[PDB]
């Protein structure tokens, strides 16, 4: 990884000696029954992650943006349910949280939900961002349920004029999807298959035994996904219901688009970071439906989004190691005690 | 041969230079640079420049 | 259809560029394309076969993606991949074959099989890619209705025809005059004979002519034209025109006089060559006309004079001939030639699976019968069927 | 081995895509692959030659890499590159040639030379890439124990054989009956002659037959079958079977009667054609059987009647024949054909360097001898050697 | 020039990889290259035609670049693109043709047309890329001075030549001895005849020899050599050397004795084969020498003895012959062959547009005339013109 | 397939190393492997039989693991284990047999039965282990396409052939000269007889020769060669060649003179022995040629002289002979021999279950018919079928 410099400085006597780390894999498949404990690991592995994920920098002044926002937003225009789209603030934070939170989730192979807020449509738009990237694969089926339908209904379908039959779902297999088979606008149509796929391409065996469910080069920094997520948006501007509606909605959409030049940057960021950090994980990691969630307020999400500039941050060298080191030890302990354990038990029998 | 300095301090130097210097091989460098004038011939015979 | 194509170049450029070693970066652009496929497929269900001796096989899809992670490729990576490819190969084979047998009069151009009809569906179009395979290249250009074109070595434009025409004959067949020929594939041999050696002919010269009408225009043809027809330079006992008896042909060969070859297009002379033997170019033609003469030698040594008496019996039969071979040419319509295996592939798959004779193609895909009555329906079906054979040969030979 | 391949496509796609001007982002994916190589190599020593008149040149590695910057390429960039390529070219040439001469009874399918044996090493595998060259494509599919396959225009399946068989003869050789033929390359010509014109034969018909056993099965063959054997249609003076004297053959040609061609596979008829001249398909066969008859003409004009008396001397010898040519076919084993230069490349390199006759191949890589006794060892060595010739021709012709 | 090349592979790899449904990323590396072009072009204006019947059309550029709508292209994307391609196609065609007609003695290796001369300009070099098309591949390697090389099937190396040489003759032409032959394309047939059947010849053997000098060296040639010259195995009435009368040739064929074929290079024997019929390799030669003998049969059955009396008249003329065919070979110079359409393309474009005869090429691009006097100027012009024809055939067939 | 193997060595090394007593530690490594199996199986469902008289049987899996607890093994431990083994034994038997009957032309190498086809599945590969059983050992090495090899005692390479060839005969069969032989299994006996005792033969010596062409090459053969053919040393009444009558053979034996045995490979002499009786080594050959002579005794006691008169009747027939036996050899192809039960196992299972004749093997798995036409398909099927028989014999004899 070019960006990182390597060099040697001290020599080594033929006296040099170390002790094998011993990093056998799982040995114990807890992935298929000991839910209670996985939840506890995930949690752990998760916090661990946040501790690492670099804090962001150079953001757009909270005030400035939200202000051009009101100009664009046309907030108080009849609609009764005001001041629910602006509890967005504390972004100088929300983004940092939303950011960290997102990574660990992934790394730690955790699964979560969404402090969702139906009315606040914007908050939804951004949702579409989320699925555009984060492999829904690791999102308890349900929180995805709400999210999508909320999009699907209070959006697309009617403002796009299509199914004015809003949508009736009981419990098929992926409501977000199916929408595809019956949408007449390619742009819209690609989003659908890609999103309902991007299954977090769960297949990898690198640097010697490190199944770390990977992710699309595409996403990575081919990014386009974003460019396409936008282009599809660029032609959602039309009739059906009251005026203060399209006006408000589309205007918000545009804020995603313009910013899109930058939104790109986001993709790259994560792409790298996850793709980097990960490298130093010994513990394997099978995707599992944790028993516990993790609340992610579209609030923050939305912030991160239109609120990131030409910032650029990455894992401090020292930081990275520290990470390796830990998992390492831990492993060593697990494996070791295992041996210590077994040994006894077997003896215990004869 | 050559090696853009601008790209060097950018790239991070791959000991490419480090090696050549160590091993002594005819080479060149390029870009903005601080010159330094000397006189007392001596300096030269002594080959200070190396 | 175009869909189909991809499926292969996908696999080829796959079973080829993916191996124990290489860098990810060389396939990054590829890997993607691949996955994209798996997705579109998974969930869908298919059915191939059911006709003649062809087995019926059902296929389902539910496969994992590909590690877009790694830097280099480790052996293990391949094997887990090759296992997935082999199911698609064995698939396509069955897909091709199934659509390589069905024919259709009305619309003999579009897809037939339940397998392919489903592919032309819109939801799969998300797979097209790299159409540089000469055949598909031309398949498209024809949809957009534009100028196509293929390349052939020793093309197969002439339906087999071996016969004669007696311009002067009598019951005893002891003083004949006429021509005999063999048109087959890319070659024509024609001989003009005059038992009397033009003894009573004006200027002691007998004129001959051989016209061959191609069923399709050939352009940019490189042709070898040589004097003499070796095939008709030896003694023969031939059946009479009415099949009631047999005549004797005892040729002695003289150089063809005033040779003129015309390559015509719609009745117009496009190229004309006068007595030029060797390599000649015919740039665009649907007809070849060979005119040549037998001129009685004005001066003869005794040995020669003895062969040509003033009165019958005529025992040595003066013969002049020409040989013409089309080495290469371009045709806007698919044809069989001496290098491509398309005709053989289609014919072979049909024979192996005991496919019943259909309404379009002659029994056994007989080339002579096909080219003799090369109707629009036969050509559209042939092109569809040849294009599929070419898609199949990218993976299965 | 596969290793080797890369080395070239690397250089080709290199000496090709690296020109003064082009935009970098067209070679980004390429450049990489390249460097990767240099690395793996540097620090290694090789040696080629040592046999016959083949020089023993030594090689070492120690090279710098390539910039990655520059929107477009400046002349200077190329020249500093071309200089590095030329050392690899002149290298590979010597590598190919060195492994293109050695043969091994045992494992004639494995690497031989000190040069290559070292390449199959694991530490070099990090260089593999883009295996789409028809030959390597098939090299892999075989190493995995699977179904191979190649393409040939006018394949070379028949070892040269020109002879005759007298089924009825006598010292004077004045009333013979039998067949004579020429099997060579992709062609067969066979004639059946009966000096008596079946005068005393049952139904006045003489049956003939010619069987040719291929050393390898051919599939998907496009074949031209024509009546008559021009090669045996002229007067000849031939040596007797025992070489003690010479006989006279004075043919007169009649149409072959009841022509039947069978393409058999392991004794089973796979394809059969009755009197069908022109283009026919033989989809899978290891044997060709041509049966044809001479039927005495039941009705004869005086001129014909005069050739066939009731009693000897028989001065005009009734002859019927067939000509069969395999235009194209597929074979699971490598073969020489009329278009590929493989055999010629291998034979030429060995001749130029005065390579001594080895234990596997016949002197001079003689094709007839090779195909006549096409043992498994000769085939494995031939395939190895043909695949190397094809790798070499990507860079050096 | 190389410039030109790109222009096409650009369009091909374009009209090919750009279709309704492929993922953007499969063309990312491509798209770029494309745009880059449009830029460099726009603004500059061109003139094509202005000779014979060739129209003078004026081309001007004013185009918008290419979008990038994400995730597989939408139909609309294509059509707006195809519209731009079609102007370039119709362009290049006119560009090729315009430079495919001009010839120049002095410097007939460089660009002639106002159209191309402008392209060699530096400001355009920025386009060149993917030089893998066999012809351009060799165009470059020659500009730097190195070992070029092309591949041909049934190469066209022999200018048409059909004649005879009487080594012993007399006015009556009743006891001749000599040879007759046909050299054409890739084939040679030669017969040696002795009316006396070597009755008074030392050891009753008459020696024959046929030498053919190639105008260019052929390397790596795969050759078929067969005994007998069928073309000269039948009765003929031929014109005398002085054209004053005609002689009679009545051959009877015997096996050629002591056959020796030598493939020489600059007078040195490179390959020699003694009586080896079938497939032989000639690795590097500029001359072929065929030596063969007629040996009077020492033992003759009555029928044979009757053909060869001790005294004239000699009525059956003893003849021995050979047939040699070059199936494939490599030549450092461009040549016409039986598969490539280059000669036909160049000849066809010139004929269609009524291009006047120039100072370099023979009228009608006549192959025999061209190869007979294959001067350096004709070769440089031929190569330029063949390379352009090959660039054109990537898009227009 | 390899899968299958394990299943057994698992059970063998199981029903063997697991008994009332021993220490855990000796099986620790084993126990594991075992369990691992049960797991992979459980849940899955199978089906065997259905063809001919073979019963159809379904099997399910749901078994407990093994106490990895205990120190030593108590009787009770075994019995609870043996009960589980017996279900697998009775299983495998049915699995083997089911795949030991089906044959297949196209792909006669890969699995056939619904039972095995399911095993080659990836999810079961988690069971392979200890492949030291000579047969599987070679099964693998062949997949990786490498040099195989088996060991045989009195191999069965010669199809049964018992006949004679009369080089000199007459209706009365009172003065014959020729050879008679018996080629069968690993033995050859051949006798040369001359009723005239070479009375009128040049040097009073009659030459004989016997050539035997193996269908497969044998390497590292230990051979016994002895003078005399006991089988042809006694009086016989034999049928004439045309079956119309019977002749009398009354031999008297003389030592074979100038005995020369040649073991050839592709026409080349690899080993040659001149009059060497006893044990000789033939290291690599596909043909054996035995040449020997009968030399009339130059000096004869009265009793001997009386047997060989100067004139007929010839009542004592001089005979010389040789006996050759291949004691052991290695072959790259499976063969029947005098020690292995493979052929007998396969033949026996098919006979017991009344398996119908298939498309590959001759009726009754007849060895002579099989080895006479030992096609690639028969060999691949034979090897598959022999390897399965060997897997089965590890548990069931
Ligand atoms: Zn040819």
From Swiss-Prot, chain B:
Source taxon at top rank: Viruses
Post-translational modification: Sumoylated with SUMO1 and SUMO2. Sumoylation of viral proteins seems to have a positive role on viral replication.
Localization (cell): Virion
Coiled-coil intervals, chain numbering: none
Family: Belongs to the rotavirus VP2 family.
Subunit note: Homodecamer; each decamer is made up of two conformers of VP2, called VP2A and VP2B. Interacts with a VP1-VP3 complex. Interacts with the intermediate capsid protein VP6. Interacts with NSP5. Interacts (via N-terminus) with NSP2.
Entry domain remark: The N-terminus binds RNA. It is necessary for encapsidation of VP1 and VP3. The N-termini of 10 VP2 molecules form a cylindrical hub underneath each 5-fold axis of the inner capsid.
Protein purpose: Inner capsid protein that self-assembles to form an icosahedral capsid with a T=2 symmetry, which consists of 120 copies of VP2, with channels at each of its five-fold vertices. This capsid constitutes the innermost concentric layer of the viral mature particle. It encapsidates the polymerase VP1, the capping enzyme VP3 and the genomic dsRNA, thereby defining the core.
Protein name as it appears in the record: Inner capsid protein VP2
Swiss-Prot record, chains C, D, E, F:
Annotated region described as Interaction with the inner capsid protein VP2, given as residue ranges: 62-73
Effect of substituting residue 153 to S: Impaired homotrimer formation at pH above 7.0. No effect on transcription activity or on VP2-VP6 interaction
InterPro entries listed in its UniProt record: Capsid_hemagglutn, Rotavirus_A/C_VP6, Virus_capsid_a-hlx_vir
UniProt entry tagged with the keyword Ion transport: no
Gene Ontology cellular component annotations, sorted alphabetically: T=13 icosahedral viral capsid; viral envelope; viral intermediate capsid
Post-translational modification: The N-terminus is blocked.
Keyword Metal-binding appears in the UniProt entry: yes
Keyword vocabulary terms for this entry: Calcium, Capsid protein, Intermediate capsid protein, Metal-binding, Ubl conjugation, Virion, Zinc
A Pfam family recorded for this sequence: Rota_Capsid_VP6
Residues involved in Zn(2+) binding: 153
Any one GO molecular-function label of the UniProt entry: metal ion binding
Compartments reported by the entry: Virion
Residues binding Ca(2+), per UniProt: 266, 286
Record annotation: effect of changing residue 65 to D: Loss of in vitro DLP transcriptase activity, no effect on particle assembly. Loss of in vitro DLP assembly and transcriptase activity, and almost complete loss of interaction with VP2
Function field: Intermediate capsid protein that self assembles to form an icosahedral capsid with a T=13 symmetry, which consists of 230 trimers of VP6, with channels at each of its five-fold vertices. This capsid constitutes the middle concentric layer of the viral mature particle. The innermost VP2 capsid and the intermediate VP6 capsid remain intact following cell entry to protect the dsRNA from degradation and to prevent unfavorable antiviral responses in the host cell during all the replication cycle of the virus.
Subunit description: Homotrimer. Interacts with the inner capsid protein VP2. Interacts with the outer capsid glycoprotein VP7. Interacts with the outer capsid protein VP5*.
Protein name, as recorded: Intermediate capsid protein VP6
